[PDB]
Amino acid sequence: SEYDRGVSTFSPEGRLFQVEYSLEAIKLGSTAIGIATKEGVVLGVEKRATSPLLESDSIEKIVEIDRHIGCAMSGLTADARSMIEHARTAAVTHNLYYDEDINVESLTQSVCDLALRFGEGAERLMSRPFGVALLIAGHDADDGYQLFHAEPSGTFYRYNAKAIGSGSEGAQAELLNEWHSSLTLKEAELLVLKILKQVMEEKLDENNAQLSCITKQDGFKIYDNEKTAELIKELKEKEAAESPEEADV
Amino acid sequence: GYDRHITIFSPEGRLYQVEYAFKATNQTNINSLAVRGKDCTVVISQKKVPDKLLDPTTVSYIFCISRTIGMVVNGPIPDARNAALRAKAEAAEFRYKYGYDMPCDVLAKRMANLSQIYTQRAYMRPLGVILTFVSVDEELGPSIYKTDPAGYYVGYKATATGPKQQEITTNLENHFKKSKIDHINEESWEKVVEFAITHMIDALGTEFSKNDLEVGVATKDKFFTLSAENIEERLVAIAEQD
């Protein structure tokens, strides 16, 4: 009875069918990990190219909403184009209306408002909710550096560190263990790289992964492949040099 | 399949919702009969008020559409009042747009075309009601025209509708088969009312008190529903006859 019930139907457990199914679709998506620290917010994504003949540069899963707001996507990335467009337009429109930068939470809420705009009847809406989750990172003078997880359920959460996609379950477990309130920016980059390499089906290099950061000074900067490669080599040298031991016990 | 839920043809070429509306028309367990006099038209309907908590003056299935057209409905009172309001509005709009009062057969054709629209379109169901309009049309004389949930409408010398309609019809038929005419040859409408009540008593085989009948009379310039006391007077006149 998939196409035999309403698209806004509630499950007997008190949930929306299409929302949970879109969450499953997101679980079938690529990995995206964000870490927020007092020095900036870092976003890393797995490009997950289908064939070696695909030019990995054209896998733009980290986009710029505004100079102070960046966004990473995980899931059906085609659905995320309209959301990114709405976010950019809303940010610049708030700038035009109030001669100031839009708050991170305000942008995230404006994006989430589109999530549950699905159903039948009528102006019309959409057929289905979005099949992609977003890590919206940014900085404002009010709440400093912020990272938000935006789901197709219209709900958004402020994470100190959040992983979404396929390898999120393990990645989140790593994040909860690897994050602290004194983490630095380079430390966050290295942690994102390490957890991505752990959860990625492929061997992590500068071509199947992409890093980006949001700083109060320089804004939203997407790391070019050379800087990401240098950070990957730095992390490999740091991990190859760790010396624990439990041979005694 | 679903050809029995919406107004689409079944494999046999039948519309089942129409037939079920026809069946629903008899939900009231009430019979109605209409006959034509020499210059009038009479309708008689059974009045059944089961609950004693009911205001007996609000239990009616005969409606005054215009000052000339009356309509007796066989079917549930929601759809009955729906059709009544629609017919009143149609008659008023006709009078406004065309300058003369809407004839009986014209209103019947309009309601039957609406029923046909319900028969063809799926988003609206047919009304489980049978509508008998009666009047004294200025061009046609005493006029009885009936419509059904299938969109069919036609005029009658006399007609009957309800559970026992066939019986009543046969009775009426017999009388006309004996009279060789198409109306009741009586000048006064009171005697035509008495005739209708007498033949309904004959057909149904039940005795009616003054609170068991509704009488609607259409004369050349009026349509009016009789009071309980006028019905009692007619019943007394019937009881005095042989």
């Binding site: 008190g14 929306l16 997880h149 994470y159 | -």
Partner: protein, 231 residues
């Protein structure tokens, strides 16, 4: 089985199932308690986090300088209903220079929810609301269910373990109804009420939200360290 596909289906027993599923969505939500005296009205809510790296979902929304509500269930539906309530209060204040009555707000919310539970397409709301306010009639606490049923109470609670807080408020009814002119004591009573509904959990600065309204006290929200004095 059947009769649960739409909100336009009545079921043979006369039960609207989608509405009951929304009520279940509320039941699976977080804990929020409301209680009022003659002078004040307090909402105490237990916020819930996805994990230890996530924030705690805000459960109390300010609708106007004299009225607010706490949510339990779908946060988007709560936002929609609170925005409609803000719009109605704004219309009352601008077109009539008049603070919107809490009872009239409840009636409007009821009709707004019922409009969704009678027409094809569109789902009933999936959140329960507890509205506190202080109008010209005094302090008011309302409980709104997406069935369209709104009821005024001295105190109540909705969500998980709501029966414990409800029974505590029933026992403490004669106590809190007389806590007039003392905000902090009514807040402590609400904290005790919501504590009567915790299982294997403890109220912390991060998971507790408080809201206060009343005479000479506009609808104010307390989160974080602001609730540390009540823990």
């Amino acid at each position: 089985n059947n009769y649960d596909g739409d909100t336009v289906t009545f079921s043979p027993t006369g039960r609207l199932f989608q509405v009951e599923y929304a009520l279940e969505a509320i039941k699976q939500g977080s804990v929020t308690v409301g209680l009022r005296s003659n002078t004040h009205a307090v909402l105490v809510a237990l916020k819930r986090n996805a994990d230890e790296l996530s924030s705690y979902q805000k459960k109390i929304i300010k609708c106007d300088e004299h009225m607010g509500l706490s949510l339990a269930g779908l946060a988007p539906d709560a936002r929609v209903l609170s925005n409609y309530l803000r719009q109605q209060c704004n219309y009352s204040s601008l077109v009539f220079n008049r603070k919107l009555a809490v009872e009239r707000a409840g009636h409007l919310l009821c009709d707004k929810a019922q409009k969704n539970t009678q027409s094809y397409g569109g789902r009933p709301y999936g959140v329960g609301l507890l509205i506190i306010g202080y109008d010209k009639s005094g302090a008011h606490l309302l409980e709104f269910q997406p069935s369209g049923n709104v009821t005024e109470l001295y105190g109540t609670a909705i969500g998980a373990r709501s029966q414990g807080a409800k029974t505590y408020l029933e026992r403490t009814l004669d106590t809190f109804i007389k806590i007039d002119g003392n905000p902090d004591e009514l807040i402590k009573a609400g904290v005790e009420a919501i504590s009567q509904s915790l299982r294997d959990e403890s109220l912390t600065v991060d998971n507790l939200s408080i809201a206060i309204v009343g005479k000479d006290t506009p609808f104010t929200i307390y989160d974080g360290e602001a609730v540390a004095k009540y823990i």
